[PDB]
Design a protein around this nucleic acid. Structure first.
Ligand SMILES: [Ca+2]
Lengths: 78, 78
DNA sequence: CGTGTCAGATAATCTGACACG
DNA sequence: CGTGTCAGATTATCTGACACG
């Protein structure tokens, strides 16, 4: 009943779910790889969709790909 | 992430999902109807099962039951 | 008795910049 | 150029106390 586009996870929980630091997660948003929702105080809130996109980035980073290369891939799989 | 016993939601998220104020939520804990995980800094983190538990409490209060009636309804056998 | 509300304290996340491999 | 760390700032949640239906 919690939908995959619902912003429900805070930084620290998302970081534990993904084994990525607050630093890496913020960096991928800076490079337009992801864009989580913000509370009114501008804190980030992640959805399950965000969860899946961060893991996608993690893997391709561990297959040796650049950030600029990962941009191409996440937006050309079709 | 759908480990139903995994603490993933902060107070404000649980609040919005349950339609209960943090005041109500913390009160039901102090009267031992729910006990959520804590970060090392003692903020609360709730699971999907916590969510179910809160919603149960909410509906039972809505039906006229005391806090101590509800504590019997939920615990003894499970 | 259960909740709203405000007060002070502490934790958590914010941006930005230097440093490192 | 991808990540760590440290500074300062603000937001979010903490406990506890007074009000009030
Ligand atoms: Ca928002």
């Amino acid at each position: 009943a919690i939908r995959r586009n619902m912003a429900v996870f805070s930084m620290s929980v998302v970081s534990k779910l993904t084994d990525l630091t607050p630093r890496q997660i913020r960096y991928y948003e800076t490079h337009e790889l992801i864009k989580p929702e913000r509370t009114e105080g501008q804190k980030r809130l992640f959805s399950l969709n965000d969860l899946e996109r961060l893991l996608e980035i993690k893997s391709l980073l561990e297959k040796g790909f650049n950030i600029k290369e990962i941009k191409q891939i996440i937006y050309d799989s079709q």
